[PDB]
Amino acid sequence: ETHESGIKPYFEQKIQETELKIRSKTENVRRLEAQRNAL
Amino acid sequence: LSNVNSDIYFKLKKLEKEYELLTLQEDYIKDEQ
């Protein structure tokens, strides 16, 4: 159980680079939705 | 826990194909406005 917990945050490090990106795009593409809705 | 480690990567590779299509949406409504 402790060998499967040390190789598990490094499977997760590759997927967490795309995940942080996807937290900021989501805010950002609704940011440009509001400007575009008023226009 | 060997079923939690094989599902993580898979889910991450699956959901990021559907959020790569919402990042195309950013380019598109930046030029549309």
B18 DSSP 8-state letter: H
DSSP, collapsed to helix, strand or coil, labels residue A10 as coil
Query: Determination technique for this PDB entry?
Result: cryo-EM
Tell me if B8 sits within 8 A of A11, measured CB to CB: yes
Chain A neighbors of B8, CB-CB under 8 A: 8, 11-12, 15
- Residues A9 and A11: their CA atoms lie apart, in Å, by 6
**CB-CB: which of A11, A25, A26 is closest to B5?**
A11
The minimal CB distance from A12 to the residues B8, B16, B33 is found for B8
Structure tokens at B12: 């991450």
Tell me the structure's resolution in angstroms, rounded to a single decimal. Answer: 4.5
Please say whether the beta carbons of A19 and B9 come within 8 A. no
